[PDB]
Design an enzyme around this catalytic site. Structure first.
Site, PDB file in Angstrom:
ATOM      1  N   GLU A 109     -26.125   8.090 -22.422  1.00 23.01           N
ATOM      2  CA  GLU A 109     -25.916   7.065 -23.436  1.00 23.01           C
ATOM      3  C   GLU A 109     -25.797   7.626 -24.847  1.00 23.01           C
ATOM      4  OE1 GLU A 109     -28.991   6.397 -21.506  1.00 23.01           O
ATOM      5  OE2 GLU A 109     -28.060   5.077 -20.015  1.00 23.01           O
ATOM      6  N   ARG A 148      17.672  38.695 -47.296  1.00 21.11           N
ATOM      7  CA  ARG A 148      18.752  37.746 -47.226  1.00 21.11           C
ATOM      8  C   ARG A 148      19.856  38.198 -48.196  1.00 21.11           C
ATOM      9  NH1 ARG A 148      19.444  31.220 -47.996  1.00 21.11           N
ATOM     10  NH2 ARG A 148      21.572  31.387 -48.836  1.00 21.11           N
ATOM     11  N   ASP A 204      17.215  31.565 -41.013  1.00 17.04           N
ATOM     12  CA  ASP A 204      17.840  32.874 -41.008  1.00 17.04           C
ATOM     13  C   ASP A 204      18.910  33.009 -39.919  1.00 17.04           C
ATOM     14  OD1 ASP A 204      16.334  34.914 -42.974  1.00 17.04           O
ATOM     15  OD2 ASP A 204      14.797  33.598 -42.076  1.00 17.04           O
ATOM     16  N   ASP A 227       7.298  18.868 -41.357  1.00 19.80           N
ATOM     17  CA  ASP A 227       6.970  18.327 -42.679  1.00 19.80           C
ATOM     18  C   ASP A 227       7.830  17.150 -43.147  1.00 19.80           C
ATOM     19  OD1 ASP A 227       9.173  19.953 -42.859  1.00 19.80           O
ATOM     20  OD2 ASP A 227       8.808  20.450 -44.954  1.00 19.80           O
ATOM     21  N   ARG A 237      28.507  23.948 -45.569  1.00 20.21           N
ATOM     22  CA  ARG A 237      28.192  24.854 -44.484  1.00 20.21           C
ATOM     23  C   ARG A 237      29.379  25.226 -43.617  1.00 20.21           C
ATOM     24  NH1 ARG A 237      23.273  22.999 -41.123  1.00 20.21           N
ATOM     25  NH2 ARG A 237      25.076  21.883 -40.235  1.00 20.21           N
ATOM     26  N   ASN A 240      12.057  13.767 -40.175  1.00 18.83           N
ATOM     27  CA  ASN A 240      12.866  14.256 -39.070  1.00 18.83           C
ATOM     28  C   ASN A 240      12.046  15.150 -38.132  1.00 18.83           C
ATOM     29  OD1 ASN A 240      12.899  15.981 -41.432  1.00 18.83           O
ATOM     30  ND2 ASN A 240      14.375  17.280 -40.356  1.00 18.83           N
ATOM     31  N   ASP A 241      10.945  15.702 -38.630  1.00 17.99           N
ATOM     32  CA  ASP A 241      10.023  16.452 -37.769  1.00 17.99           C
ATOM     33  C   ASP A 241       9.067  15.538 -36.991  1.00 17.99           C
ATOM     34  OD1 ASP A 241      10.778  19.160 -38.370  1.00 17.99           O
ATOM     35  OD2 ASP A 241       9.829  18.854 -40.355  1.00 17.99           O
ATOM     36  N   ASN A 268     -29.621  13.606 -17.018  1.00 11.44           N
ATOM     37  CA  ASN A 268     -29.351  12.347 -16.344  1.00 11.44           C
ATOM     38  C   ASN A 268     -29.429  12.531 -14.835  1.00 11.44           C
ATOM     39  OD1 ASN A 268     -27.502  12.006 -19.095  1.00 11.44           O
ATOM     40  ND2 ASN A 268     -28.451  10.085 -18.408  1.00 11.44           N
ATOM     41  N   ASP A 302       7.569  26.910 -38.199  1.00 14.74           N
ATOM     42  CA  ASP A 302       8.614  27.112 -39.195  1.00 14.74           C
ATOM     43  C   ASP A 302       8.329  28.381 -40.011  1.00 14.74           C
ATOM     44  OD1 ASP A 302      10.115  24.426 -38.932  1.00 14.74           O
ATOM     45  OD2 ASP A 302       8.036  23.761 -39.359  1.00 14.74           O
TER      46      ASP A 302
HETATM   47  C1  LIG Z   1     -25.145  12.114 -14.179  1.00 17.87           C
HETATM   48  C2  LIG Z   1     -26.101  11.865 -13.037  1.00 17.87           C
HETATM   49  C3  LIG Z   1     -25.714  12.420 -11.662  1.00 17.87           C
HETATM   50  C4  LIG Z   1     -26.755  11.889 -10.665  1.00 17.87           C
HETATM   51  C5  LIG Z   1     -24.326  12.104 -11.139  1.00 17.87           C
HETATM   52  O1  LIG Z   1     -24.035  11.280 -10.301  1.00 17.87           O
HETATM   53  O2  LIG Z   1     -23.309  12.980 -11.481  1.00 17.87           O
HETATM   54  C6  LIG Z   1     -22.544  13.397 -10.374  1.00 17.87           C
HETATM   55  C7  LIG Z   1     -21.025  13.345 -10.615  1.00 17.87           C
HETATM   56  C8  LIG Z   1     -20.659  12.183 -11.516  1.00 17.87           C
HETATM   57  C9  LIG Z   1     -20.527  14.801 -10.833  1.00 17.87           C
HETATM   58  C10 LIG Z   1     -21.714  15.775 -10.660  1.00 17.87           C
HETATM   59  C11 LIG Z   1     -22.887  14.897 -10.160  1.00 17.87           C
HETATM   60  O3  LIG Z   1     -23.066  15.065  -8.768  1.00 17.87           O
HETATM   61  C12 LIG Z   1     -24.298  15.578  -8.442  1.00 17.87           C
HETATM   62  O4  LIG Z   1     -25.122  15.716  -9.327  1.00 17.87           O
HETATM   63  C13 LIG Z   1     -24.535  15.759  -6.964  1.00 17.87           C
HETATM   64  C14 LIG Z   1     -25.185  14.522  -6.332  1.00 17.87           C
HETATM   65  C15 LIG Z   1     -26.658  14.289  -6.696  1.00 17.87           C
HETATM   66  C16 LIG Z   1     -27.064  12.818  -6.525  1.00 17.87           C
HETATM   67  C17 LIG Z   1     -28.235  12.356  -7.395  1.00 17.87           C
HETATM   68  C18 LIG Z   1     -29.332  11.605  -6.635  1.00 17.87           C
HETATM   69  C19 LIG Z   1     -29.266  11.832  -5.136  1.00 17.87           C
HETATM   70  C20 LIG Z   1     -22.232  16.688 -11.792  1.00 17.87           C
HETATM   71  C21 LIG Z   1     -22.903  15.937 -12.950  1.00 17.87           C
HETATM   72  O5  LIG Z   1     -23.348  17.408 -11.264  1.00 17.87           O
HETATM   73  C22 LIG Z   1     -24.022  18.481 -11.719  1.00 17.87           C
HETATM   74  C23 LIG Z   1     -24.750  19.047 -10.525  1.00 17.87           C
HETATM   75  O6  LIG Z   1     -24.274  18.666 -12.894  1.00 17.87           O
HETATM   76  C24 LIG Z   1     -21.286  17.784 -12.343  1.00 17.87           C
HETATM   77  C25 LIG Z   1     -19.909  17.438 -12.935  1.00 17.87           C
HETATM   78  O7  LIG Z   1     -19.966  16.857 -14.223  1.00 17.87           O
HETATM   79  C26 LIG Z   1     -19.259  17.487 -15.213  1.00 17.87           C
HETATM   80  O8  LIG Z   1     -18.557  18.451 -14.948  1.00 17.87           O
HETATM   81  C27 LIG Z   1     -19.509  16.905 -16.574  1.00 17.87           C
HETATM   82  C28 LIG Z   1     -18.302  16.132 -17.110  1.00 17.87           C
HETATM   83  C29 LIG Z   1     -18.479  15.892 -18.605  1.00 17.87           C
HETATM   84  C30 LIG Z   1     -19.060  16.613 -11.969  1.00 17.87           C
HETATM   85  O9  LIG Z   1     -19.157  17.175 -10.692  1.00 17.87           O
HETATM   86  C31 LIG Z   1     -19.391  15.099 -11.820  1.00 17.87           C
HETATM   87  O10 LIG Z   1     -18.209  14.581 -11.206  1.00 17.87           O
HETATM   88  C32 LIG Z   1     -17.178  15.535 -11.199  1.00 17.87           C
HETATM   89  O11 LIG Z   1     -16.016  14.829 -11.435  1.00 17.87           O
HETATM   90  C33 LIG Z   1     -17.545  16.508 -12.365  1.00 17.87           C
HETATM   91  C34 LIG Z   1     -16.764  17.819 -12.359  1.00 17.87           C
HETATM   92  O12 LIG Z   1     -17.558  15.902 -13.615  1.00 17.87           O
HETATM   93 MG   LIG Z   2      11.487  19.936 -41.920  1.00 17.21          MG
END
Ligand SMILES: C/C=C(/C)C(=O)O[C@H]1C(C)=C2[C@H]([C@@H]1OC(=O)CCCCCCC)[C@@](C)(OC(C)=O)C[C@H](OC(=O)CCC)[C@@]1(O)[C@H]2OC(=O)[C@@]1(C)O
Ligand SMILES: [Mg+2]
Ligand SMILES: [K+]
Length: 994
Positions: free
Chosen positions: A309, A560, A627, A703, A489, A706-707, A768, A351
């Site tokens: 959040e 030039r 040029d 600039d 030209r 037209n750009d 989280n 440029d």
């Molecule tokens: C935020 C809270 C968690 C619980 C969550 O769900 O994030 C998952 C998920 C959304 C991905 C995972 C999380 O999955 C897990 O954590 C495994 C399952 C665990 C379950 C929890 C309770 C049983 C991220 C969090 O896990 C790790 C282990 O950190 C890493 C990463 O996130 C990123 O790369 C951050 C993007 C700004 C993502 O795998 C992401 O999805 C993919 O698309 C990525 C590339 O995004």
């Molecule tokens: Mg120009």
């Protein structure tokens, strides 16, 4: 009428069926209005205040949060706020965050500026027409102008539509059209057709473009196109048709949110299936309504636990502060998320004039013919010192200083430079330096003339303000400039026709002095001047002249060149027609060559280094210049884009060459090209598209309006601080100093920024993960809530938000420009790192539930139950004469929640430090390395105590402080988390590749 420039005045009048004397009939205006619409670009795009906020709630995480608030709210009204009136607190906090985030959206949007709207600054309110209902001219609203209209424009007028000139009422018509063509000075217009239907705008000598200004004169025209059909109209439509893609981080977060719903959704089902035993329970004997409320107190906790959040606030505040830092280094960032794309740039198209170079020109070399006698030819080559526009410098022959006057060929060279010249100088007293008045190129000539002092004018006894044009002025008093044949030209030269002024010495008569691109000019010479004598132009003399020109332009001099020449017997004055530049080439034939001048537009001092940084960082640099191809290549060599001896046949292209390739081979050309010479604005956009077909991240400069389309289309459009407002509004970034090296320094920051962003994103999200574990265990086992949404929100917005922003100030990696551009598809967390946070999360969700339960089980001040089923705490109301001899409101006690809330807080402080570096142990990379990080951690800890101690807040948070000893346990539990990642860090270093 799109092709009006190629049509005669008669044809355009006939096309629309309009008299040049009468104008349109009211009927015609009626019908032309209906067919062509009003003369204006479309109204702004559709987005309203009510609509703005709906878009604030399309976000998937935002959506889940909203829903969570509702369940929170029901729980409030249907739980006794008489036992705890601190219950209607939870649903309220959630809502507030959502309001902030939506207010963020509307303040940002209402303060945003659309580039297409900036175009409308080029629409005049009014315009002037002749129409049949009145004899005198009519001032009407410009939008009411229609194609076929007989229009009138004059000095100061902004041109209201694309207009084919019919009649120039003044002796001359000059137009400021820099915004469309990037022509610096006003340009002459004419009335005759321009033969090529595919002529570029700079060559439509008989057109006035909507949005440009009349610099001098007065003219009558017929409106060719209006509204969206004009040149500025076509630009608007290109822009409007340009979808700007999401930044990589934006995409990755949508990815996250997408996946985060899926996971949360999975967890909910999980919860219910170890609690599937709730079905084998008797229909009577259980408070379902308390069980259902239980899965909802846990439901809102889940949504709160999973969502970072505080992350959008941290992201925006880091970018803001990066931006302030960038602006001290001349890079003015317009779009905060651009900073990341900027760090990803793999190709920079720039440029040349004014950004790779200073646009500060001076003549460095010149030669005249010394002698022609058969196959023998000799030149007199001179050099000229002084790189500024000041009259400070000397002329040198074989490094020896000479008096220019001593050479007859040079007095003529100077007089051509002085007279074939619409520019001049002026001395500035405020800034204390000499400045140009006119083109940079021509002003270099007037500077040259001042240094030559070819009549040895008493110059020593001259003051600065008058010193500026002193030698030039004694030449301008010798010949009367009758008229001038402006540059075009098709012939790449210009000329002035002069008669002898009153002369004490009766001259040969009238002269024409011409200067231009050497090839054309030299071909039109039949003679060469040798001193005051004249000799026919021969092969050996030509080859010798051209060979030197090639050397100067094509070698390390990168000069030039202009050829200078005079026509000794010009046409009789009365046999010339000055209203059509089609003939000016013919008037400039049978010339006598007199000399060449070589001027330099030097690279900016820093540009060398930056080009090498780009090499080091694996960023391609592509020059775009006016040029010729040979000098473009040489200039590339001079600044390091090409090696001095590198074969660059396939890495350099002219607009002409590029167009003559089939589309397939245009694309392959963009893969490797580092130099485009003499291109069309058309080409900038095409080049970007091609580069995007190789999934390149393209920065591109511009600039003028037209750009604007290329700027809109590039991943990072980069505008000049001295450029148009329209180009700036179409750009992600503005260069306060126009300097290329400012781009490179901004790419560096962009990389530094993102690396620090990586860390606090990895950190908040991993927390989280952890919270979601705690909430999961609470429900999976059936314990009293170890953590409450009210608490979890506080942690996520505040206590973790400060070290998050502190990690924004992680010192940068020293090798950060010695690595290739980062792939935009690089996951923030994956593979091995995924496992690391998989483990850390598993830890903290156990630590928090533990301390809460440790207050319940194995208790000192709690119920002290050793290994009992205090998982059944809910059924202690009726089942107390069954099992417990002990109380039951002990299960709503604060102290377990604040054991949990305290171990959470302390854990995340430690994990913030594990997050100072991805893999470097605090062995080699200490925590004192981030000055502000250690500082921020201590502040959140205060805030922990604040919600524990200050009379209002503990009840709000369902918290109660813990004495001198209960913290030892908090530290027993929470402190180990450091030892965990310190190990997993050790591992990556020594075993997997890295
Ligand atoms: C935020 C809270 C968690 C619980 C969550 O769900 O994030 C998952 C998920 C959304 C991905 C995972 C999380 O999955 C897990 O954590 C495994 C399952 C665990 C379950 C929890 C309770 C049983 C991220 C969090 O896990 C790790 C282990 O950190 C890493 C990463 O996130 C990123 O790369 C951050 C993007 C700004 C993502 O795998 C992401 O999805 C993919 O698309 C990525 C590339 O995004
Ligand atoms: Mg120009
Ligand atoms: K762009």
């Amino acid at each position: 009428m799109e092709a009006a420039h190629s049509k005669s005045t008669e044809e355009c009048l006939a096309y629309f069926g309009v008299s040049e004397t009468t104008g349109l009939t009211p009927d015609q205006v009626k019908r032309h209005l209906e067919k062509y619409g009003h003369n204006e670009l479309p109204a702004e795009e559709g987005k309203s205040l009510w609509e703005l906020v709906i878009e604030q709630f399309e976000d998937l995480l935002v959506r889940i949060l909203l829903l969570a608030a509702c369940i929170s709210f029901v729980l409030a009204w249907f739980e006794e706020g008489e036992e705890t009136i601190t219950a209607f607190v939870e649903p309220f906090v959630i809502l507030l965050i959502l309001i902030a985030n939506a207010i963020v959206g509307v303040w940002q949007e209402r303060n945003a500026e659309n580039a297409i709207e900036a175009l409308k600054e080029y629409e005049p309110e009014m315009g002037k027409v002749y129409r049949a209902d009145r004899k005198s001219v009519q001032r009407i609203k410009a939008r009411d102008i229609v194609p076929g209209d007989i229009v009138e424009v004059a000095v100061g007028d902004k041109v209201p539509a694309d207009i084919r000139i019919l009649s120039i009422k003044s002796t001359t018509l000059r137009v400021d059209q820099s915004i469309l063509t990037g022509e610096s000075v006003s340009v002459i217009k004419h009335t005759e057709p321009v033969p090529d239907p595919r002529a570029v705008n700079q060559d439509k000598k008989n057109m006035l473009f909507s949005g440009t200004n009349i610099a001098a004169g007065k003219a009558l025209g017929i409106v060719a196109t209006t509204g969206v059909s004009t040149e500025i109209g076509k630009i608007r439509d290109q822009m409007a048709a340009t979808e700007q893609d999401k930044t990589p981080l934006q995409q990755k977060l949508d990815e996250f949110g997408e996946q985060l719903s899926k996971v949360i959704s999975l967890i909910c089902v999980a919860v219910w299936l170890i609690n599937i035993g709730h079905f084998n329970d008797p229909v009577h004997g259980g408070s379902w309504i308390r069980g259902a409320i239980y899965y909802f107190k846990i439901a809102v906790a889940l949504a709160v636990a999973a969502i970072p959040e505080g992350l959008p606030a941290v992201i925006t505040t880091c970018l803001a502060l990066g931006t302030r830092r960038m602006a001290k280094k001349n890079a003015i960032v317009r779009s905060l998320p651009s900073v990341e794309t900027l760090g990803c740039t793999s190709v920079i198209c720039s440029d040349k004039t004014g950004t790779l170079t200073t646009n500060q020109m001076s003549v460095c070399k010149m030669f005249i013919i010394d002698k022609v006698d058969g196959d023998f030819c000799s030149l007199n080559e001179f050099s000229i010192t002084g790189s500024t526009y000041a009259p400070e410098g000397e002329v040198l022959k074989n490094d020896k200083p000479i008096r220019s006057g001593q050479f007859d060929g040079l007095v003529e060279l100077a007089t051509i430079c002085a007279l074939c010249n619409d520019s001049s100088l002026d001395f500035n007293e405020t800034k204390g330096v000499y400045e140009k008045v006119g083109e940079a190129t021509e002003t270099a000539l007037t500077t040259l003339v001042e240094k030559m002092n070819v009549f040895n004018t008493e110059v020593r006894n001259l003051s600065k303000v008058e010193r500026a044009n002193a030698c030039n002025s004694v030449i301008r008093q010798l010949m009367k400039k009758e008229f001038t044949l402006e540059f075009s030209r098709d012939r790449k030269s210009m000329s002035v026709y002069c008669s002898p002024a009153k002369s004490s010495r009766a001259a040969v008569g009238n002269k024409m002095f011409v200067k231009g691109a050497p090839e054309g000019v030299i071909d039109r010479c039949n003679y060469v001047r040798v001193g005051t004598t004249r000799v026919p132009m021969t092969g050996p003399v030509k080859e010798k002249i051209l060979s030197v020109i090639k050397e100067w332009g094509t070698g390390r001099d990168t000069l030039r060149c202009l050829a200078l020449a005079t026509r000794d017997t010009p046409p009789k004055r009365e046999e010339m027609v000055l209203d059509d530049s089609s003939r000016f080439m013919e008037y400039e034939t049978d010339l006598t060559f007199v000399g060449v001048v070589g001027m330099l537009d030097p690279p900016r001092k820093e540009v060398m280094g930056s080009i090498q940084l780009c090499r080091d960082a694996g960023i391609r640099v592509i020059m775009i210049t006016g040029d010729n191809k040979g000098t473009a290549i040489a200039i590339c060599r001079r600044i390091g884009i090409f090696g001095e001896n590198e074969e660059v046949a396939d890495r350099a292209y002219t607009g002409r060459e590029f167009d003559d390739l089939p589309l397939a081979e245009q694309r392959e050309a963009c893969r490797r090209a580092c130099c485009f010479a003499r291109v069309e604005p058309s080409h900038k956009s095409k080049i970007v598209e091609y580069l995007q077909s190789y999934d390149e991240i393209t920065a591109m400069t511009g600039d003028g309006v037209n750009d604007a389309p290329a700027l809109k289309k590039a991943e990072i459009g980069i505008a000049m601080g001295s450029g148009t407002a329209v180009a700036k509004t179409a750009s992600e970034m503005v260069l306060a100093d126009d300097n290329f090296s400012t781009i490179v320094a901004a790419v560096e920051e962009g990389r530094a920024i993102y690396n620090n962003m990586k860390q606090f994103i990895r950190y908040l999200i991993s927390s989280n993960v952890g919270e979601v574990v705690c909430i999961f265990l609470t429900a999976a086992l059936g314990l009293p809530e170890a953590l409450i949404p009210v608490q979890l929100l506080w942690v996520n917005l505040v206590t973790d938000g400060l070290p998050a922003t502190a990690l924004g100030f992680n010192p940068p990696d020293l090798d950060i420009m010695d690595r290739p551009p980062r792939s935009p598809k690089e996951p923030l967390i994956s593979g091995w790192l995924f496992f690391r946070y998989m483990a850390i999360g598993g830890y903290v969700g156990a630590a928090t539930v533990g301390a809460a339960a440790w207050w319940f089980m194995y208790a000192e001040d709690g119920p002290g139950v050793t290994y009992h089923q205090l998982t059944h705490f809910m059924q202690c109301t009726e089942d107390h004469p069954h099992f417990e001899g002990l109380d039951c409101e002990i299960f709503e006690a604060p102290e377990p929640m604040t054991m949990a809330l305290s171990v959470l807080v302390t854990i995340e402080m430690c994990n913030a430090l594990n997050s100072l570096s991805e893999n470097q142990s605090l062995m080699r990379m200490p925590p004192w390395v981030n000055i502000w990080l250690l500082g921020s951690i201590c502040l959140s800890m205060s805030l922990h105590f604040l919600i524990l101690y200050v009379d209002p807040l503990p009840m709000i948070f369902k918290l109660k402080a813990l004495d001198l000893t209960q913290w030892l346990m908090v530290l027993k539990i929470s402190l180990p988390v450091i030892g965990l990642d310190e190990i997993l860090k050790f591992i990556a270093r020594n075993y997997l590749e890295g």
